[PDB]
């Protein structure tokens, strides 16, 4: 049974700890009700269109000095603490925090994330004009700071139309300040560089989602492992091309820059080695057919405590070992066996081959996983994870913890919130006096 | 059991359909066996290493003249007509033809293609040095020509180290000439242009796979629909952001620059409209909450023959209509029921929302698919298919069946035997059978 009301105080008593005012009244009155909401120190989300820049700017600046959040006018979507606000979707729980100055942009970005197998913490709408040259991205900065302080939001994803020079610059620096892996989606804009410190740039919705999930998977694992002591990366590859791509990929992640003797990369003690090179094959069979060399080198890492991460490629199929996984496992266990607790050896592998190959992809992967080796589907993820693990680890907004809504405009919004069984009180509001049926009937008819 | 032989005589008599000689003997002898194979008009694959550029060029130029193929020295991987050659993988059959001057590069690309649910026709290894300046892509050109002529190879994917300028130009041009959607992967090479006509440039193995699979899905769906008459694209969007991205993507595919009244795109009669714009919402609910208008416009398409493709978005979730799919199908059917068979209307929809939404993602997609509307997972694919459906419109004997005369290593023949592929093992050696000491010396030195 929806708790309707018709006076502010009546709504505030039916919901003492109300947190947000969702305004969907006629634009001409939205700003008014927003300030009345702030007078009661409530966060505001204006789904309402037809609101002037001046009022939006006034409301957002006022919300800043008060330490509140005003999801600017014409904000069609938001989902905070599992609470659907306006046009929202039921999302799987995850570690991705979404911020957007777009309606269906947020919706599609989120739909693609779920479709990609991950989930979100919150999806914060800002209002279509927040990033405008005149608004200055006030709400976008407040949103970033909030999620930045939300530990459950390990990865950040931002979506909006491309902002102007001064504004996008302010947004990026703010994104960098959070220190969290962040995907910045500037709709229909091919970015300068693909990555800038902790910021990854995308130009399309599903590209952005693909990236957000990848960062999500890498950060998730890195937090679970919780590396504490730094060290170096050692890549022992059996496939030349694979070694070369992993090398190029890792160099980019490290901001590091013709490769002699199979040494594909050697920077700051990190190494990516092609054991297939002639330099390692004198007097012995190719590593892809005989695992003896590589396995010994793996076992011997037990004597190189400075080596924190071991990168591996496992290539199956005809012409390869019968069951590489098993001997790989024993070999790396011997290594780990010889390490002190503060000198662990994390292993990361990618598997190249199919389910029907003799060795069987799924069985090989399971063997690796059961032993504790991290198996990822692609080199970009494998190397990104490796780079993340070498550097050890280094107050959540009350609005993100709980959301109590005083719904003012449309009743349907209050009703949909009822479905989610979220705390809501519906404040029936109208711009026409109670007895003026003529005008009430007219307004309805015209709309 | 494995048929074993000691002379070309026996090999060919035993394998009358021999198509290829897989050679893994010591490099100093590989070119010689390769020419003996060419003397018998057999294709060649030299897994064998330690072969000079000089011999490679001689063998490949000779092969080209004979209308045959020599997969360069140091070619560790190939799969042709379901036949695994050397370091190969068991692959599901699909519509993607792969070519590579890389060993594990071909393997990883295919492994990714398989994981994405697609398959290949063949994976033709070229030899690590085929695209070098000295060789000039001889085998690369041949393979491209072969896959260009293979009807089952509907999408092509090429992978290799970045070839020098002249070679690269020649290669890209040959890819353009096939006319088939093609992904060109030049390992660790930043492409300035992402797409050039039918060629998509990629930088990483996973990206190349992603693109190859995307083109695979689009081309497979188009060939199924088998369009006959060209026409126009009409996008009717309810979500503003989705309309603009769709507009931006299609403008790119149609290679044209593309704002007012919600008309996100309007070039060459192709239109992408944002029905959520004020221009279409005066006096009525937003199209995301009321389908009336859009459904009307869709139904009205039945009277417009030239409109061949209809693009749609369907956003579900708490605030949208209770069952979008149902009404869309209905308006959709009316339009189709008014069209003559020669003037069909193909519908393509992207669905935004989750399995948990009130409308239920899978439920909506089912209703849409049941009525013949094509549902795709992303705007790039939807717009790409939209552009593919408005056009519209023999196979090399080696790609039909492979019968191998194996010469170097025995393991490769056993590999073929286990997969029930036609094979004969030519037991060969540099030392004549009568010299015991020399034989011991060789056996020991290896």
UniProtKB/Swiss-Prot annotation, chain A:
pH dependence: Optimum pH is 9.0. No enzyme activity is detected at pH 6.0 and 7.0. Activity increases in the pH range of 8.0-9.0.
Origin species: Escherichia coli (strain K12)
Subunit field text: The OXTCase is composed of 3 subunits, AllF, AllG and AllH.
Role description: Component of a carbamoyltransferase involved in the anaerobic nitrogen utilization via the assimilation of allantoin. Catalyzes the conversion of oxalurate (N-carbamoyl-2-oxoglycine) to oxamate and carbamoyl phosphate.
Keywords in alphabetical order: Magnesium, Transferase
UniProt-recorded name of the protein: Oxamate carbamoyltransferase subunit AllF
Protein family: Belongs to the AllF family.
EC annotation from Swiss-Prot or TrEMBL: 2.1.3.5
Effect of deleting the gene: The deletion mutant cannot produce oxamate during anaerobic allantoin degradation. However, the levels of oxalate, produced via a glyoxylate shunt, significantly increase.
GO biological process, one term: bacterial-type flagellum-dependent cell motility
Presence of keyword Transferase: yes
GO molecular function: succinate-CoA ligase (ADP-forming) activity; succinate-CoA ligase (GDP-forming) activity; transferase activity
Pathway: Nitrogen metabolism; (S)-allantoin degradation
Cofactor: Mg(2+)
Covered residues, full protein: 101 to 555 of 555
TM region positions: none
Thermal dependence, as annotated: Optimum temperature is 30 degrees Celsius.
């Amino acid at each position: 049974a929806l708790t309707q009301v018709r006076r502010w105080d009546s709504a505030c008593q039916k919901l003492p700890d109300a947190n947000l005012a969702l305004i969907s009244v006629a634009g001409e009155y939205a700003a008014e009700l927003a300030n009345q909401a702030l007078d009661r120190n409530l966060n505001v989300m204006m789904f309402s269109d037809n609101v002037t820049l001046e009022d939006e700017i006034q409301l957002k600046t006022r919300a800043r000095e008060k330490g509140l959040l005003v999801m600017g006018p014409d904000c069609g979507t938001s989902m905070i603490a599992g609470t659907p606000l306006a046009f929202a979707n039921v999302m799987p729980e995850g570690n991705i925090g979404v911020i957007g100055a777009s309606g269906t942009g947020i919706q599609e970005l989120c739909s693609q994330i779920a479709l990609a197998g991950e989930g979100i913490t919150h999806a914060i709408g800002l209002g279509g004009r927040d990033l405008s040259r005149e608004v200055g991205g006030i709400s976008a900065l407040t949103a970033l700071e909030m999620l930045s302080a939300d530990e459950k939001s390990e990865v950040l994803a931002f979506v909006s139309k491309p902002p102007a020079e001064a504004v996008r610059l302010k947004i990026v620096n703010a994104m960098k300040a959070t220190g969290k892996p962040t995907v910045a989606l500037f709709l229909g804009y091919t970015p300068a560089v693909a990555r800038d410190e902790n910021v990854w740039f995308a130009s399309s919705l599903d590209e952005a989602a693909r990236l957000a999930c990848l960062l999500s998977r890498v950060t998730a694992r890195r937090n679970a492992i919780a590396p504490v002591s730094s060290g170096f990366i050692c890549g022992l590859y059996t496939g030349g091309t694979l070694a070369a791509e992993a090398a190029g990929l890792l160099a980019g992640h490290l901001g590091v820059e013709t490769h002699q003797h199979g040494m594909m990369l050697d920077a700051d003690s990190h190494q990516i080695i092609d054991l297939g090179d002639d330099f390692y094959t004198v007097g012995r069979p190719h590593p892809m057919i005989d695992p003896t060399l590589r396995n010994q080198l793996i076992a011997d890492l037990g004597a190189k405590p400075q080596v924190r991460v071991l990168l591996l490629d496992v290539v199956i199929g005809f012409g390869a070992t019968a069951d590489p996984a098993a001997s790989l496992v024993s070999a790396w266990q011997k290594a780990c066996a010889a390490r002190l607790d503060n000198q662990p050896l994390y292993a990361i592998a990618t598997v190249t081959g199919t389910e029907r190959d003799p060795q069987c992809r799924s069985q090989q992967i399971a063997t690796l996983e059961d032993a504790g080796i991290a198996v990822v589907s692609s080199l970009p993820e494998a190397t990104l994870l490796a780079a993340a693990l070498i550097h050890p680890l280094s107050h959540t907004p009350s609005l993100l913890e709980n959301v109590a809504v005083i719904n003012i405009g449309l009743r349907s919004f209050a009703l949909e919130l009822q479905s989610a069984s979220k705390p809501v009180v519906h404040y029936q509001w109208s711009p026409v006096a109670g007895g003026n049926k003529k005008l009430a009937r007219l307004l309805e008819r015209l709309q």
